[PDB]
């Protein structure tokens, strides 16, 4: 600007910490996606030897996603939610960088390692679930929805002070009018039926999906590439078709008459969560199963909340959850490959 004060401008330019002077991250890219570019980085002044994650947000300037991600992360503080350490605004190229502590692991890679075979240890699974629930409860208590929960957004810290601690990452930033209108595996039936807003219950559905995926190593609602027919078909092949009594307000959903046109109850008559989970060697009289079933309730008003799930007697049955998901045992999962 020509009508901005020169002294003010050059003073700020002199003091401005630039990402590329502070951090070595050249060719250390670990993620590329709709989030943007995520690098494993090191501080160039050798003050600390910690690993950091540097995310360059997709796009330039201050978009809604960018604006709201910064706004919320600046306020949110909980052990199970990823902490924003610093924000770099690069003035030349109008790029926003965000700094986080580096999480060596995540549930996409952990589950896929187990699926490459050893099923996930039962102690670790419960601890993962407890910390996901703890983190989501904190977000929900603050009226913050994630809106995109899935294994790849559940980070787990590696060796260092926070060994085996879940960090929930990349909250669904953002959605215009809080409205949803290629992965459909973690989406609640009501979204698939044309629900017009995200809710706490939608997050809770995703958590049940994750929990089932931890117990079996298979995504419970795996399906091929709003209303998606085959995704709904898969839910019903697992869960059965909901009776009128199980989900009374299903008639209120915008895509309900489409569901009636395309589907018949009788197709899914010998289908239930019980029979699915028994084929994957999980007992239907287990506290695990009973908790899972409450999470995977079809009618969103009959799904338990995060707080009720944390109170579940599953977490009082031996073994107790631990702060370190790996329970002091050696971590067999490989470190992140660079791109």
């Amino acid at each position: 600007d020509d009508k901005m004060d020169y002294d003010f401008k050059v003073k700020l330019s002199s003091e401005r910490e630039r990402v590329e002077d502070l951090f070595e991250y050249e060719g250390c890219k670990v993620g590329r996606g709709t989030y943007g570019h995520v690098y494993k980085a090191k501080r160039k002044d050798g003050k600390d030897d910690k690993d950091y994650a540097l995310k360059q947000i997709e796009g330039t300037g201050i978009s809604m996603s960018a604006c709201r991600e910064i706004a919320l992360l600046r306020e949110l503080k909980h052990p199970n939610v990823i902490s924003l350490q610093k924000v770099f605004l690069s003035h030349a190229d109008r790029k926003v960088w965000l700094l986080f502590d580096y999480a060596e692991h995540d549930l996409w890679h952990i589950i896929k390692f187990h699926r490459a075979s050893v099923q996930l240890p039962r102690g670790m699974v419960k601890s993962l679930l407890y910390q996901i629930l703890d983190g989501i409860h904190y977000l929900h208590a603050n009226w913050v929805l994630h809106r995109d929960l899935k294994p790849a957004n559940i980070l787990v810290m590696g060796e260092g002070p926070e060994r085996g601690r879940v960090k929930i990452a990349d909250m669904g930033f953002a959605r215009l009018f809080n409205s949803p209108l290629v992965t459909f595996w973690y989406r609640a039936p009501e979204l698939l039926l044309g629900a017009r807003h995200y809710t706490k219950a939608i997050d809770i559905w995703a958590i049940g999906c994750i929990f089932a995926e931890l117990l079996t190593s298979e995504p419970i609602f795996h399906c091929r590439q709003p209303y998606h027919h085959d995704q709904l078909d898969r839910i019903f092949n697992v869960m059965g078709f909901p009776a009128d009594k199980d989900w009374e307000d299903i008639k209120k959903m915008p895509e309900h008459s489409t569901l009636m046109k395309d589907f018949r109850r009788n197709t899914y008559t010998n289908c239930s969560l019980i029979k699915y989970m028994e084929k994957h060697k999980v007992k239907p009289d287990s506290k695990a199963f009973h908790l899972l079933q409450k999470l995977l309730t079809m009618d969103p008003i009959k799904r338990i909340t995060s707080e009720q799930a944390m109170q579940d007697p599953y977490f009082l049955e031996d073994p107790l959850p631990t702060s370190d998901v790996f329970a002091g045992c050696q971590i067999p999962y490989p470190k992140r490959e660079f791109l």
Partner: protein
């Protein structure tokens, strides 16, 4: 709404409730050109500018209020000469509307609103048309965000006010006036110096006194620092005397010419 119960661990509480004496020391830079009196008149004026930009864009009061707070935070640290407040004002609305989940207000629409509001509602202060393009708004936005240390979630008195009048059972009687008085407190430093619920309580006290409503007992049953509430009441009461004695329309051109000027590059 996002972060509603978290005021006590918020960036607003921990970073942006300021010491009054720190505030006034930083203000001395600008007081070499303007009197105290003229400085508070500028603040009122730009408060009204932001209001007008907001009404024109059809934004809710909370968006306007957040924008107003961003403007105040910036000039709490920095001189009026550092960035033209004529540029900062529509930049603050623009950023606030993206925080508060309304939308990225169209560029042509933001620029059209600033042009239109200054022309039609503020021609007494500005002879020339709004001279900034969108690329200037975009530049200013980066500087604004950096200064506020990316603190974007702001808490306002409207929410607690509403809870207090519901509690009293006098939403019909007092809410219109108390809400209006909350709007008026944005013409002062109060939002930089006091938690929002305290400003709410002071505005509600004044509304009750204006309407001859006895709420002594209801106020006595609060577990709150009543000296601070009285401090806020006084600032409100003085604000209305200031308003009475101020002709914005006759005085602001002169006061705007006294502002210190952004130095050009060599």
């Amino acid at each position: 709404k996002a972060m509603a119960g978290n005021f006590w661990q918020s960036s607003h509480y921990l970073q942006w409730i300021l010491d009054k004496q720190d505030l006034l020391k930083e203000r001395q830079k600008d007081l070499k050109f303007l009197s105290e009196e003229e400085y508070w008149k500028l603040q009122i004026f730009f408060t009204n500018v932001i209001q007008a930009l907001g009404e024109h864009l059809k934004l809710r009061q909370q968006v306007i209020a957040t924008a107003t707070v961003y403007f105040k935070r910036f000039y709490a640290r920095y001189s009026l000469k550092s960035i033209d407040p004529v540029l900062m004002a529509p930049t603050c609305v623009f950023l606030a509307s993206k925080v508060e989940e309304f939308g990225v207000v169209s560029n042509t629409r933001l620029i059209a609103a600033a042009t239109s509001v200054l022309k039609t509602r503020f021609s007494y202060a500005f002879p020339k048309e709004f001279p900034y393009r969108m690329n200037h708004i975009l530049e200013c936005e980066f500087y604004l965000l950096e200064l506020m240390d990316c603190c974007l979630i702001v808490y306002h008195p409207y929410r607690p006010l509403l809870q207090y009048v519901q509690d009293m059972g006098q939403e019909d009687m007092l809410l219109p006036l108390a809400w209006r008085i909350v709007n008026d407190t944005y013409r002062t430093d109060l939002c930089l110096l006091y938690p929002p619920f305290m400003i709410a309580l002071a505005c509600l006290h004044v509304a009750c006194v204006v309407q001859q409503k006895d709420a002594r007992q209801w106020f006595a049953e609060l577990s709150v620092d009543m000296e601070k509430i009285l401090e806020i009441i006084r600032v409100i009461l003085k604000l209305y005397e200031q308003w009475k004695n101020f002709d914005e329309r006759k005085e602001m051109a002169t006061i705007l010419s006294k502002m210190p000027k952004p130095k050009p590059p060599p």
